[model samples]
Target: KRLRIGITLHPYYSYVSNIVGDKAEVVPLIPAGFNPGAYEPRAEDIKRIGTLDVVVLNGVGGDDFAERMIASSEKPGIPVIEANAKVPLLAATGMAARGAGKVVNPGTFLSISASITQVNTIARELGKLDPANAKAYTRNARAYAKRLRALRADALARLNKAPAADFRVATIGGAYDYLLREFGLEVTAVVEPAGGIEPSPSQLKKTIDQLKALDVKVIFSEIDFPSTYVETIQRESGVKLYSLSGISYGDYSAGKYEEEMARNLDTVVRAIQES
Candidate 1:
């Protein structure tokens, strides 16, 4: 029987689809147009879990809401695949980094290196559940991973050289540490109070001052979750802003990850070159 695998986020839908190919079916735990950051469990969404054989989760912190849905669903014992279980996660930055930075950033899907690690881990775990297609799953994952790696390599080639030492960066949200780390860049400051929450007026003023003080050259903002405050920061701080896809919005598809990731890489490269 074909396995009915559930995915909690848009990127996971792409990852699982690429890995399983046609060997299994991928089901979304929630409908599209709902922001995962501000998502609340609905009865219909929770009921969907009763039909799934297993679930793949961004277990670090991305889709913790899925746990609540699963626990209340008919199939509370459904097996789960922690996609970030083996990936080396970065510590949360900005206000999200509470508890002395014990919080783990859950944006692994935004980085090519971290995404590949998750792809391998998901494949290995899925193989354990569907042994008949184990070899096929491994084969598919490698091919998919190869394509993802080339996207990064090509971007780096276009970058030509490492960013200048003075190229300091910042982001409106604290989600891009994993992606920036791929290029040896670090975020000087994260302006948002949390992933999707816009900072208050006073907080925004303080953030603008901090950005200027930190000498941040560029700020990367979210394409999917835009706010007027982002432009306000740019105008006030005199720093150029670049938009990166959060990959958490829109309709889930097998190719969404690759398509968005390529654009993200190009955006980062452009930010580096232009600055």
Candidate 2:
């Protein structure tokens, strides 16, 4: 029988699918169209866990919903694969970090460096679960990882130079810290106090003031979940705005991660070249 592997998020769906190919069945813990950031567990979704042989987790922060579902499901003791177990993690920024108690950024899928690390870890662990196809799993992971590396190399080649030391940047939320660090850029300010929560008028004004005071040259906004206030901030702060994919939205597919990540890298390159 094939291994029925479960994935907690969209990127892991792609990661597991690419690694296992036709050798295993990849199952999504939740159906499409649910926003992972604000998702509540549904009985139907939780029931799907009973059919899975093992569950793969982001294991950092974003997919905490899976743990609840796993415990509630019929197969409460299902084996789990922690994809970020070996990847170096970054600390959460902005309000998400303030009183969050040592929260690690769970946006590993947003960075090529982190994604490759995760892909290797997933393949290695999945191989342990399905030894018959261990060699094929490693081969597919290398091929996928190589393609991901090429995307970063292509973006850097187009950039032709590194960002200046004073090229300060900010984000509408704390999502892009991992992605921005790939270019040696650090987030000077994060506008949103938390993910998916809009700030009050006074808070918005404070964020704009902070951006200006910090001399942030560019602001990256979430493409999947755009906010009207982002425009206000851009207009008031006069910082050029760019949109980045959180890789947390839409349908799960094997090619979704690579396609969206390429666009994300290009957007970052454009943000750097323009700013």
Candidate 3:
């Protein structure tokens, strides 16, 4: 019997898919390609969530839509599984957080280590909630975690060759701190203003000044929200740009996280080696 499970955010859908396997039906709260920040939930989204047994959450501000949908959900007792609950968080930077001291970056799914934690956490919750297939869920999580660890190890090994100090990366948005941190890379500047809205001319010049001053050679931009200013920055500053997946919008598949991150790792490794 496939247990009905609802997941918020694109990456969470991938994480939960691996943990639950075919044992449970994993439902996505947001449709693929919807921007989490600008997401305005439709009545159908809320109605769909109400049909699930439990809803998995990113548990941070990024996916507040899920929380609202659940609250309005006519589905009584639809328990929530906070994917980040067991995973330690990193301090938010740039637009990802309100201030420098905030500890609420919700892009943990972009990092291999953090994603493993999320998978394990989801497995544990699913096990406790549905004891009938606890062993199966745990087994799948272990296998998945091992694969994730290997990917992390491989990325670290490849990235270690480049030496972090040789490069200063500029990110187009507030996302990817976790992913960059895994490779020991530092973020020189975040190009976008808050909420990833287009920057004013003055703001753009200011960020451009920072990038040029820092000598940032690589600019990491997200696939979901392509920044128009990034092209301008490349032209003005002459920095090489590499695209990294936000993993915030994609098809609901178990291996998409790994596939996407693997591609991201390739870009980082190359960025560092060339820098």
Candidate 4:
């Protein structure tokens, strides 16, 4: 269904909003803060929901505060879409594990994770919630995915040609890992807060070790997280800092999906040089 009203986090709405166009408006639910998972949902956040046709959450574990908000709000007609609902959430262990937070799913029982097809499926289904503009939303959704395919191709080309193993990028938020995988890029380190917290001392030490061991040169700090942690890490580790891209650009201003992707691609390419 076509969403006439919507709200999202700060860093990612840019991509989705372009595709959504006039069919919907994306609102920023969570404000920029220290911990995304432990975010404080302001009364304005709840009040905004009542006015929206849809709200997007990362998932239950991804943003527990959001789950509580949704549960408590009970906004009758408003629907909340979990962006990471089925997206293959990464395990927090081994070579693939990111140490900032504990893994949501262990190695084998990861069927609960969502894949690209799964994400698209959710978009399609969510598009149905507002049947009045379902066709438009579906068309927009497909078009958006198509554009992402092109971006993926470009990213792969860059990654394949990227210098050495140490030139690999690491994610610091919920958004990067999946997109990197989709684009066949190398991300050697991740510094996210598990369940969303500042990296514990042990976690930070481990992440630093990984960065040093891998010769990692760049950390993809997100706009949503406090730069202090990553800034400290960068100063200590001497790794250059680059902002990894994501949804929620709409919160800054009314932008469409294309603007988001373009911004993301540009950011990623520049981040490569930071290494």
TM-score of each: 0.89, 0.90, 0.87, 0.61
Candidate 2 segments exceeding 4 Å error: 162-166, 192-200, 222-231
For candidate 1, lDDT tens digit of each residue in 188-246? Answer: 76775433346667766776786777676877764333458667867788887777878
- Which residue runs of candidate 1 sit more than 4 Å off their true CA positions? 99-102, 192-203, 222-232
Per lDDT, what order, best first? 1, 2, 3, 4
Give a tens-digit lDDT track for model 3, residues 184-241. Answer: 8887777654333466788768766766765668877653324577678767878876
Maximum-lDDT candidate: 1
Deviation from native of the Cα of residue 36 in model 4, angstroms: 4.8
Model 4 misplacement above 4 A: 1-4, 30-39, 74-78, 93-101, 105-119, 160-175, 186-250, 253-275
TM-score of 2: 0.90
Give Cα-based local distance difference scores for all models.
Answer: 0.83, 0.82, 0.78, 0.54
Cα lDDT tens digits, model 4, 1-275, are 33544434432354346446676665666654434544577777766666566666545354566556656565744566656544555644433234446565311111112323433654565566766666766777576566656765665576566665545666655345554555445776555444233767777776556556545676665434357866666767777666644443223553433455556666666676445
- Where in model 3 is the C-alpha error above 4 Å? 94-96, 99-103, 188-203, 222-232
